[PDB]
Amino acid sequence: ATETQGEHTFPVEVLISGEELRGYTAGEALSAGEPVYLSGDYEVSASSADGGEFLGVNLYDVASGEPVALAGDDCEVRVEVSEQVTANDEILPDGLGTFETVATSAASAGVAIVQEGAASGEVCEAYIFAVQGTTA
C-alpha cells in the first residue's frame, strides 16, 4: 500500500490508533497490511478467503521464519481493499493479501468496520473488532 505526493511514492503507515500490537513467527513471506491467521504454534500466515482465518494485519514486511508484529482487534488501520467500500461496511480477508466486504464474500460476519471509504485497489481506513479461528 502506497501514497503519492506528486513525484514521490511513500509507504502507507498501516496503524492509525491502538496498542494491541502482538508478536508471532512468520510462516511465510508477508507484506505490510496483509491479513494473517494462525498457521502453527505462535506462527502466522496469510489469510485465505471466506473467514475462519484472521488474527490481525501484519505491520511490516517479513521473510519466512522472521518475528512479525501484528495489529489485532481494538486497532485502527489503513488497509488496501479489493473492491469499493463505504463507511459502515464490514470487511474481511479476500485471500489476495487484501480485504473485501462481508457482503461480497461467502462469510456472514467480518473482522473490521470501514470508517473511511475507498475505491477498488485503494486504501480505506478501518477499525478491527474481531478475530476468526477454526470453529468447524
**Amino acid identity for residue 2 in this structure:** T
Q: Per CB under 8 A, which region of 7-15, 37-45, 58-66 contacts a second copy?
A: 37-45
Nearest to 94 by CA among 135, 39, 134, 34: 34
Q: Give the one entry of a second copy, other proteins, Mg ion, none that residue 136 binds, where binding means its C-beta sits below a cut-off of 5 to 8 angstroms depending on kind.
A: a second copy
Query: Judged by CB, which is closer to a second copy: 61, or 73?
Result: 73
Binding site for Mg ion (CB under 5 A): 17-18, 74
Beta strands at 43-46 and 21-26: parallel, antiparallel or unpaired? parallel
Residues 45-64 that bind a second copy (CB under 8 A): 52-53, 55
d(CA 32, CA 34): 6
**3 strand-pairing partners:** 10
| Contact (Cβ atoms closer than 8 angstroms) between residue 56 and residue 99 | no
Query: Judged by CB, which is closer to a second copy: 14, or 70?
Result: 70
Which residue numbers belong to the known binding site for Mg(2+)?
3, 19-20, 73-74
